[PDB]
């Protein structure tokens, strides 16, 4: 059992939750817990090496991990995207030899891919064609995931030459040592402090030709046609909205934990004990009832991931809009909870709490950092169009 | 397919819903559209005659109905609930006789149950104990469900004779047409206007021995010991929050259906079509999002509440525990959910939508009356019980 | 003192306020006992025969009675609209000899005006120019505002003559009693159901040149340049903002007393008196405390609109600007207040507020219906493009 | 004018506001600043030295100061607090002497006062009667207000000698230059970092008989009177409930100036400029109306504080009640307005604006921090007994 092992991580993690938080760098050591644990390869199928887990089993993966550190969440979350990628537009031969790679080595995959706010070409990393049939990339992704502590690296390029190339977007999987390649230790923010979301930088890094996934533009073209390969938004949204969901959960433990043995009463209200404040109580019923909402439609979109994610190509420009509508909204409610049950979770807590010695402000820190990777009023747009027009999002990196 | 019948009725009743609602009284001819469908014998084991049907399948087809009518999806929904009590206190003979019966005589079951917030002392319906075994009925009670078209009634009395008896709650199924038993025309509200919620005399009615089901005060018993009786407030308190949700669907079907055809842009926006405005498709958005997440909650409790029902007797104080705490938290959200999303639609549809041949508010007033049944407050309140102190709801007729 | 005498004229509607909701049609005796009041004058100056009271003492009388009446409290405050326009548009010689008249004869006005939602030439109503310098009136106005009872009624036509002037809308102030002129009683809404809000027929009705307001297209001009005639719309969404406000306190009062006096503790929960609960205390708080917000905005609104209603043409852009933006917050403000407390005075009221006889639905039916006159959204839109970019609304007829 | 001199100390503080937020510690230079600014004699007579100003001036001063800086508009607003004591329970021989030389000598003062949630016998600093009138401390004071920089200290202690004083709260103001005084550098929390707030030990302390202000007891008999000392909690509350206006005022301005300048269009949803976005523009919207409403509020309480405080001793518990239903009020709607804007400021904000340089969380945490000093919880409670029981709240340190 994934979870019951991601479990235990959580349980060895939380000692150091606190202090990893203020420090902010690197998670060296967590990374190597999960490395360790062979929990890397929770998606490759058990025949390459791996567990073989089903997309809601791996959610639940996400969720707990989550719990413990919204930064290792969103890490281990935003690896499991990666690998997908090599099925979604990669060759049959592709697949196996790097899903075998990923599990017998346990590889950590990074990400410096889609610029989803510029035209593409505005992109920063240029793909340049060469006679083999590879690229050689140069520029810099600004902003990563992922990528610094990485084995395995899947780059965008964009094609930027004058040939009737131009604008094509340029998927590949190449080894982060590589050489001209530098993930920097670059990432600051409020929150999500241990995710190393900085730059990368590529200089005249060479691709070969088994190492590029698919043919030019070929996310695009899927895209414009919702083949499989546009299953990569509804893949990492749901993980995006479960990171959330399993850091609301984080705080809510963390406070119900706080109001059991730190909480005073409030005795001008003759209350005689914190736990049984009728507010108090009323706050952990919404907060849990929130929550209880916003599980039940993340794991509903979870198993249509999986009924979708089964008919491989076989998949309808209905099949992806509808799991894609689905998934938006379970964005949006993670998103409102996580925000709402991080911040009322103080007021439970009490002036107190506020010290920084529990920490505990990085919840809604986390939450409120990565809530922002895409802005989730045109996820509740979304939505809405399908709702009232029958219209499907329009298929990109993050719809 | 009890779901594709049940959508057959739906088409048919609503072409009436809005002058239905207006008009008041009981919906005579739809209450027989039901019985001709077949569909009052849902739950009744298919070896009795019934469709043996399980609870989800059960709820889908109370959702279908209260989406086109709130009164008939209550009406219907209540009925449902009433047989099962047989098999929660009566007795084998009871089940295969009763049963057998409802099925075959496409039988209408009715409520004079519970008073929810009342010391049984005070009850108005009086059981007074008879030397063969039997009860007499007499007094009002004064909120019933379902009893005035019914042809089976399920009441209670209470022995406030001076008997060893006495303070009891008695279960009885009789007919309803039995002599002193006097269901009035007497139901007024200003929601759910025909689900025939008024009183019933009983004025010396007699229960025969074999009509009585379970010992005397076996419902405050199975309540105490949380064996099967207590499955009563679960099951009834899933149905009305379907019912609800049901109803939100039926409102926002409507005001999508009226927005597209009726509604005019604001021009003074330079809006040119009404169905491209911003804030109109933000607040589809918002609603169908709240409803995907009350929807899955109510969903993963159905099968829940399949769960507990098929461990019979063997079920533990656990079981219904955790059951309840989860409708509780399902009646919340749609309760929620439903008012908002009943009264929010009048934004989308527009000044001209406030006609009365439209009868828009009919969907809001359905779910602002019957949502006080039971204080949705101790609904959240034993929710965050449970979360923060670990308590389980004390059972009852509502929790 | 009008306050006083607007407590007084409520105190005389109180018996009644639950049938003349349920009646409809039109509040004759009430707009007669208003019309006796020497109310309909409160905004006339002293010198011309009225009270000369000021924008914060008439929104205070117009806030007593929405309190008693929704209905009468939108017939009131828009009777306050129109004559103004004289004022704004009209010369030095109609704003005394209509201000004199309307004083002295005591008159209602009533509103056959703008077609907020069309573009000009799309108008129902055609006014063609005569060679005396008047216009005649043809058409249909389908949504009107008090023209059924009014004396002197506003009404708006467009030059479609292929005249010169054409596309000029014309205002103009003309006796409801003119021949050709029909209110029709036509009006039916779930809410607001005696505004007498219907459509009004034109068949060749005579307006002659000291009946025309300003030069034809007056409204627009003195819109494009924001001087005087532009405080149209703040005026009268001001006016607005204060029913629902009005109508808000209306339903708050409702519920105390019956909360105090007929209200059931919810024994199951061990509460023995309702007035205690802990949850029912922090709902009638919360009612409170978002009234005191909108209603401490509203009072502040009415100030600056008085300072800036004393600088006549002196007024710049900004000064209505600013106005218009307080004004559009005050009525987002009032909306959301209104319609949260008319709903939600239900959970505290309890199932046996659901009766008719109470008529408790008839709070929120009537803000419900008439919030729909224009967009809230486009209030909230106004604000947020002044807040983030110093931008002003477009001056039109509700903004 | 006071408040130009507040805006000329916010508009510098701005500029090293994220630095000293990130830095913690004592405000020494900016604390320097007000003591030079003559702004702590803000309250003292003119008579005396000080400004005399009325208490809307006093706390527009509080909210000019907490717009820049959280910590300072605490720090400011709870010396303020300190001053009227001396009037509220001192003799007039103490008031002449201590506003002196508070205006004098522009001394800061500080408070080691109150244990809110504590009751009299438990609180960590004893008060033992001295022969000569006087008292000696001991024990140390957890949680306290500026006492650290402050040159005059405000404290209680409580009787515990087993004489016939005992329980009596002693009120005290010494030099915090006394021997047996040592306010601790210990403050540290996740908000409101450099309001020095951390503990004080009292180490046999000397109380000269001249230093206690009123009688043994003074302001808990003042506050089951209700006589004018029990204006504390309705003075230093409302200061409070504009420190988080301040605050949200501040994160709302810090956005606006982003926005315009740094904040990216979200090109796939084929916005080209920032703030032109339709969901965006309605967050600001949202955003200044929730203000606008609150700000309102806050104004009408401080007129009303006026009102009841300058009916001396005159003022009845009436007088105190409302005026204390009517500030607990404003602060929740300032705890709720300052919340959902410091935090919802951020998704207008975008990505790039959570680094760590532009400490656009620290107004979250400030107002996070502070809002817990005591639950807004039952100043909402407060309110409804209020509304539903005509109930007044219970007078004490907070209420």
Redesign the interface.
């Known amino acids: 059992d994934p979870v019951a092992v991601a479990r235990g991580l959580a349980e060895k993690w939380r000692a150091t939750a606190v202090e990893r938080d203020r420090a902010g760098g690197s998670a060296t050591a967590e990374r190597e817990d999960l490395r360790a644990s062979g929990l890397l390869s929770l998606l490759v199928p058990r025949e390459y090496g791996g567990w073989g887990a089903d997309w809601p089993t791996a959610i639940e993966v996400v969720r707990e991990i989550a719990a413990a550190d919204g930064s290792l969440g969103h890490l281990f979350g935003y690896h499991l995207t990666n690998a997908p990628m090599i099925e979604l537009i990669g060759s049959q031969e592709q697949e196996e030899h790097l899903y075998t790679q990923i599990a017998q080595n346990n590889w950590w995959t990074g990400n410096a891919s889609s610029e989803?706010?510029?035209?593409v070409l505005d992109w920063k990393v240029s793909a340049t064609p060469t006679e083999d049939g590879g690229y050689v990339l140069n520029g810099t992704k600004h902003?990563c995931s992922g990528a610094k502590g990485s084995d395995l690296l899947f780059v965008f390029g964009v094609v930027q030459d004058d040939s009737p190339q131009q604008g094509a977007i340029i998927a590949a999987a190449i080894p982060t040592s590589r050489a001209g390649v530098t993930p920097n230790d670059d990432w600051?923010?409020?929150?999500m402090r241990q995710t190393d979301s900085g730059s990368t930088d590529f200089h005249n890094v060479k691709v070969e030709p088994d190492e590029v996934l698919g043919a030019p533009n070929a996310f695009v073209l899927a895209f414009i046609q919702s083949e499989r390969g546009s299953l990569f938004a509804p893949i990492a949204q749901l993980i995006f909205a479960n990171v959330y969901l399993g850091i609301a959960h984080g705080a809510?433990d963390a406070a119900?934990e706080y109001?059991?043995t730190q909480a005073?009463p409030?005795?001008?209200?003759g209350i005689q004990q914190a736990?049984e404040?009728?507010?108090?109580?009323?706050?952990?019923?919404?907060?849990?009832?929130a929550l209880?909402?916003?599980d039940?439609?993340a794991?509903?979109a979870a198993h249509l991931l999986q009924t979708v994610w089964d008919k491989g190509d076989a998949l309808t420009p209905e099949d992806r809009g509808e799991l894609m509508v689905?998934v938006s909204?379970?964005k949006?409610?993670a998103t409102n909870a996580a925000?709402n049950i991080s911040?009322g979770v103080?007021?439970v807590?009490?002036?107190r709490?506020?010290?920084?010695?529990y920490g505990?402000?990085r919840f809604?820190?986390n939450v409120?950092?990565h809530?922002?990777?895409?802005?989730?009023?045109?996820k509740?747009?979304?939505?809405?169009?399908?709702?009232?027009?029958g219209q499907y999002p329009?298929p990109?990196f993050?719809?």
Chains 1, 2, 3, 4 share one sequence.
């Open positions: 989803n706010n510029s035209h902003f600051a923010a409020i929150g809510l119900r109001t059991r005073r409030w005795t001008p209200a736990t404040d009728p507010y108090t109580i009323r706050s952990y019923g919404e907060f849990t009832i209880q909402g916003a039940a439609a794991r509903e689905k909204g379970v949006a409610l925000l911040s103080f007021e807590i009490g002036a709490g506020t010290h920084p010695r505990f402000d809604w820190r409120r950092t809530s922002l990777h895409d802005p989730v009023s045109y509740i747009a979304d939505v809405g169009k399908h709702t009232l027009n329009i990109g993050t719809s």
